[PDB]
Design a protein around this ligand. Structure first.
Ligand SMILES: *[C@@H]1O[C@H](CO)[C@@H](O)[C@H](O)[C@H]1NC(C)=O
Ligand SMILES: *[C@@H]1O[C@H](CO)[C@@H](O)[C@H](O)[C@H]1NC(C)=O
Ligand SMILES: *[C@@H]1O[C@H](CO)[C@@H](O)[C@H](O)[C@H]1NC(C)=O
Ligand SMILES: *[C@@H]1O[C@H](CO)[C@@H](O)[C@H](O)[C@H]1NC(C)=O
Ligand SMILES: *[C@@H]1O[C@H](CO)[C@@H](O)[C@H](O)[C@H]1NC(C)=O
Ligand SMILES: *[C@@H]1O[C@H](CO)[C@@H](O)[C@H](O)[C@H]1NC(C)=O
Ligand SMILES: *[C@@H]1O[C@H](CO)[C@@H](O)[C@H](O)[C@H]1NC(C)=O
Ligand SMILES: *[C@@H]1O[C@H](CO)[C@@H](O)[C@H](O)[C@H]1NC(C)=O
Ligand SMILES: *[C@@H]1O[C@H](CO)[C@@H](O)[C@H](O)[C@H]1NC(C)=O
Lengths: 19, 324, 175, 324, 175, 324, 175, 19, 19
């Protein structure tokens, strides 16, 4: 959802570790 | 018996995205980034709120000279780019030539706004007939007409006195002045229109030193006429002055154009028409609404655009080689 | 794979490790489960992000076409203009496509080598206190609670702590 | 005592092929692929069965105007490319200028076949002498001559009536029309050849509106002559018509060229001559017969060619670093 | 070598292995001989073929010169035309030569890493059932008929089959 | 207890040099090589011992025509490059036009030395006044003057006989000849200066066939004058001859230029002046003294220069990733 | 690091090894000190020198701008000329900057792999006659005078010479 | 000769495994 | 100083092994 395990500004891991 | 274990491994997922490499094509990856914009809205829109100048069936020459069929563009507001069709139908209604036409359109691609001013009023021709120069090649509402911004001057009482008219550009801006010369079919028509047999048109500024002389020849009839009208132009600087001297065949200036706004613009060749939209990037095939660094729509764009490439596909691999 | 880890001695990927590019799967008798290594995955995301920005930034000085017009007796310079513009477009299309190909290859090898380095890191940590199963797994010569699991995941595993219980079972297996 | 063994190793062979890398040159490999074609046959050959047009010692102008020394090219068949030497010796036998010559050769590089037609027969000049316009600068078989495709018209009985001749292109194809004007040395020769002192040549089509006037001047003698002949051309479209009016100095059209085949062609600058061969790729130095993706022969080619590069060597490594 | 296999810990190549880029040489007491690994060599031939086709395909949009002619008073645009054409030719020559250099380097390293991966594959297969001689060879701690030779060549070697005969000889060598 | 040890490791040092990679910026390395030259001396210097030609406030036209304010360049020695300001103040003192000016400057960028010779002495005008053609637009020491290398010829005793003067280039080198025509304000001044009402200037060589005719027009006064002077030039080859015929408005040649040294040169646009230095590489902003393969100073250079790039930084990593 | 040696299992660099890019630090009871490996460092200097010369040589056919002048009614071809020159300048700036980026990355990885290959070379030399400490160091299972130190530095280390004293201490440590 | 151990359309292994 | 451990024409190891 509204938080991620990673700093991913461009979304190179699209969805991995976001909840 | 089997001790505890720990294994090192890597991510897999449902991804079907494919990337290419030098040694292998169509490699499925867990994560990719498409960087190529392939879509447009198929419409000609405003550029950052400013509406373009759509010339429809009129060319640049018909616009600036005032082809009667171009009355929609008698006094156009500030534009963001110009749109002209590949082969406009309303060009030179009276057939002829436009001297240094392409250089003038190049000048145009850096101007955003003209301001038309009357520099020689059609009224002020007391010794010549300033309202007889009409033709069926330039019709307007079923009656013969002519370019609105220039005056085809005719003899008055079998007389054509030597015109000597000067205009001093008193404005602050550069001034695009246009004028022209008539080439008739024979000496008969020459005397019938201008009385004097051997005529001329001298034009002079601080840098211009021109003397035109009518060329008579029998030619093919285009739009009914074998005569030709050849048009010339110049940019009169502030405080400079233009001088006209003529004893016939003079297509006198009436309205000129004050260059009041300059900036980045373009003459875009497109068959589309206004689509009542807004964009930050326009192509002759449609507007682009994208964050991607590349596109493959058209090489000729205006605005804040992606960089054009000819490829049909451009995908970066970000993740791993994805396991089936 | 240039480094033989991804689709190499580690044959497949883990659909179950959903919050990391690389990581571990442990199986002691407290239980078994997946845990992502976030330092390595974040380092890799840093690298890949900088690579994407590098490509895009290097491409912002690329050629921009300009409309130009010529008349019937200027066919030589109109042809010259067309070939100039098409040549620059072909050049920059070559640049983009080729850079994408090369950097795609190098990105895949980058992930491969990241996996390989993770594996080597924990192998060098554990040494002879574990048997190397040859598929990316280590069979512990002692018993590893869920916390020496995190000790091998965070790089703070004490070899001399279980040295001689591992040597216990090593001497046992040798007879 | 020594147990069984298995060793992992790699291929070696007799190969001496060398490749280069960023960090090391002249690295021997077991397998390479040369991708650079460095050889040609040194001959000018047909392109896919179609023979080129070798102009030998005649230039393009001498060919189309009909320089008497160019009779080999009076009616050339369909060609694949044109070959012209760097400095042909048979150009303008009567010295002068060829207006818009380079644009005409550009037009040529897209035409594969002309069809010469007689549009104004040299017979039909009843009021002028159509067979006196000869010169020693243009000799043919030891007697003075002139360009075969244009007529140098002379006064007849101290008279030069005003020619008014029109030709309407009734064919389906574009028509390359050529004509010319004479510049004599003095008013003496002017009256001697044309009687009228101040002369002109008006030319008119749907887009052409030309009026030439002879320029008299004392000049250096080139090939014996101080007079000059200046030639002009145009492309007359189907159903359009060309009109000539003149009272002297007119180099009238006789034959014009019907553009009956268009396609990709080129004017190749080469000193070679026909070599009675066939090829799929031609360069001004020889034909190429290759499957390789690159060559370093010449940048200007025609046909199905490799891509040109300036390198002297281009070898891909396919195999391993080869052990001595 | 980037991967230390070719001309590294394996010092030379085999003129006797004539039908493969990589492979094995076995020496049990049934005999000794060369055998090429065709899966790896065919994978490498696939990669190299696709690389060659990639280079050649990327080069088919390259600039093509055109003859253009100018008169004595058009020297500026003739010079412009010449420099345009020569610039595009220099650009594409740079592209070709540099791509060839870079991909040659990467091809040599590709072969190096293929050898290294083959070696690692059979080393991970055999584990402590063999001593690692350090030159690309393994000395078997048991006896390997010509068919466990093919079992290590096809990736189906059973470690627990000879586990304790290898442990036999390992305990023997240790005393 | 702990046995002997040996460890494998790598170099570290005090280095702060940083390099960039695709995946990481500002990476400190133990050893780098800067390959970008960013410094220049801010001076215009000799090129390999040869001093340039600094035109200061005079343009190329004012130099070759002999604008009185350009006497510093009456007979310049051999140069290495030419320097001209963006907008020189000493150009055409008498206002007008320089025909084919840019092509002439292109010719210039391959010539290293002129040799001025008197081909038509101002003395030899016995039937015309060769010392009255002066103007206040071209002043020299408080008294009216004119271009030093051309003669403004005036009528003598209300007569302007028809000049017919020829010069045969007997030298071994090409010869740059310049001449001109006058455009007055009205027929009054026309007769006042040249008596004859309709005048002309014929010029002829082996390839030149020119006939100029004065264009009269009222124009704006530039530097006091509404008349214009239009200048023409040509390259007369060895053994060829130029012929002038005129009955007025002739700006006759006096001095011409023998092209005695050719080679690589350039017209550099720079506001700097001579700096009494020497260099092997010059830019319009300063000389470069460098061994580096690249520079970012200016795209337009001359000499043995580094290759220009637009980057602000270009550093190669040679050593290792340096440990803190 | 692509090869996990520099700033990997070897965590830092040696300020004390001042006359070599790679090398050794020995510590027997004769003493301890640094010694550079000059064969590998000179091979690397060869590679880096050839790389620098390669870049510079490939860049000497790059575009050279030329001053050209046009009058008020030649704005189309003046604009064409300006965009031609600026396009070639942008192209060659892209080439230079991108080649520098890519070759910088490959140079760093080249040094990494050189370190890794040195480490692997002496590890394969010593085999079970030494314990692999996991940080770039080997703890000798026998005693190594300052001359078997040079024997492992010059690649002429005799494993069967100290085979069974190393096996002595290996059997000792195992109990 | 007329058969090969490998699919080698471009001949990148020229002669290896052809009999 | 006036001698080096290495052949380093371009100085890619600047100062390393020169005495
Ligand atoms: C890759 O896939 C596309 C369709 O998705 C196909 O057209 C193309 O031929 C494939 N490439 C190869 C090398 O098989
Ligand atoms: C030429 O002749 C055709 C008849 O086929 C006619 O239609 C056309 O109008 C003519 N053109 C001129 C210019 O007379
Ligand atoms: C297109 O532009 C509109 C207007 O700004 C915006 O609402 C929309 O989000 C844009 N398209 C996308 C895909 O974001
Ligand atoms: C490579 O070999 C050629 C001759 O085959 C030689 O001319 C060239 O100098 C060599 N290159 C190097 C770097 O030695
Ligand atoms: C110029 O003079 C030379 C004599 O040296 C002569 O050969 C040449 O023909 C002359 N040229 C003209 C045009 O009179
Ligand atoms: C050259 O072309 C001829 C004719 O098609 C052909 O027989 C020959 O094989 C070609 N050359 C080569 C090397 O194949
Ligand atoms: C690298 O350092 C410079 C200053 O030396 C700084 O301006 C730049 O932003 C830095 N780059 C990054 C990616 O931090
Ligand atoms: C035009 O009028 C202005 C007055 O504002 C004057 O200064 C200028 O000299 C005039 N120009 C000409 C050519 O008469
Ligand atoms: C600059 O040139 C001078 C004169 O040749 C020379 O003495 C000096 O060493 C040069 N600059 C450098 C940094 O070498």
């Amino acid at each position: 959802x509204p938080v991620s395990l990673y700093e991913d500004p461009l979304g190179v891991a699209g969805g991995m570790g976001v909840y | 018996d089997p001790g505890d274990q720990i294994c090192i491994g890597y991510h897999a997922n449902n991804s079907t995205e494919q990337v290419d490499t030098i040694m292998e094509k169509n490699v499925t990856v867990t994560h990719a980034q498409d960087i190529l914009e392939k879509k447009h809205n198929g419409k000609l829109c405003d550029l950052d709120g400013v509406k373009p100048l759509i010339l429809r069936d009129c060319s640049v020459a018909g616009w600036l000279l005032g082809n009667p069929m171009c009355d929609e563009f008698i006094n156009v507001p500030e534009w963001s780019y110009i749109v002209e069709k590949a082969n406009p139908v309303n060009d030179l209604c009276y057939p002829g030539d436009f001297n240094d036409y392409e250089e003038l359109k190049h000048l145009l691609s850096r101007i955003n706004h003209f301001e038309k001013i009357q520099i020689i009023p059609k009224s002020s021709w007391s010794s010549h007939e300033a309202s007889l120069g009409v033709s069926s090649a330039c019709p307007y509402q079923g009656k013969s007409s002519f370019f609105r911004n220039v005056v085809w001057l005719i003899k008055k009482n079998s007389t054509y006195p030597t015109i000597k008219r000067s205009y001093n550009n008193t404005n602050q801006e550069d001034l695009l002045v246009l004028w022209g010369i008539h080439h008739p079919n024979d000496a008969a028509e020459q005397t019938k229109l201008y009385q004097n047999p051997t005529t001329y048109i001298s034009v002079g500024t601080s840098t211009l030193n021109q003397r035109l002389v009518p060329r008579i020849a029998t030619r093919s009839k285009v739009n009914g006429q074998s005569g030709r009208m050849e048009f010339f132009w110049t940019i009169l600087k502030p405080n400079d002055a233009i001088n006209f001297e003529s004893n016939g065949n003079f297509i006198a200036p009436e309205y000129a154009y004050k260059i009041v706004k300059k900036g980045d613009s373009t003459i875009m060749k497109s068959e589309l028409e206004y689509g009542n939209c807004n964009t930050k990037c326009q192509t002759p095939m449609g507007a682009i609404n994208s964050s991607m660094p590349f596109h493959n729509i058209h090489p000729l764009t205006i605005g804040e655009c992606p960089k054009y490439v000819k490829s049909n596909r451009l995908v970066l691999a970000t993740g791993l080689r994805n396991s089936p | 794979g240039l480094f033989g880890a991804i689709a190499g001695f580690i044959e497949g990927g883990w659909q179950g490790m959903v919050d990391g590019w690389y990581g571990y799967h442990h199986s002691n008798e407290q239980g078994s489960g997946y845990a992502a290594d976030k330092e390595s995955t974040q380092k890799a995301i840093d690298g890949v992000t900088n690579k994407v920005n590098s490509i895009i930034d290097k491409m912002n000085t690329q050629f921009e076409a300009v409309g130009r017009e010529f008349n019937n007796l200027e066919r030589r310079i109109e042809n010259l203009n067309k070939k100039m513009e098409d040549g620059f477009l072909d050049v920059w299309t070559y640049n983009a496509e080729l850079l994408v190909l090369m950097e795609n290859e190098r990105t895949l090898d980058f992930h491969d080598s990241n996996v390989k380095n993770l594996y080597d890191k924990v192998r060098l940590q554990l040494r002879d206190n574990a048997k190397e199963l040859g598929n990316g797994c280590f069979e512990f010569y002692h018993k590893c609670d869920n916390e020496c699991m995190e000790s091998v995941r965070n790089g703070t595993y004490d070899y001399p702590q279980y040295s001689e219980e591992a040597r216990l079972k090593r001497e046992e297996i040798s007879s």
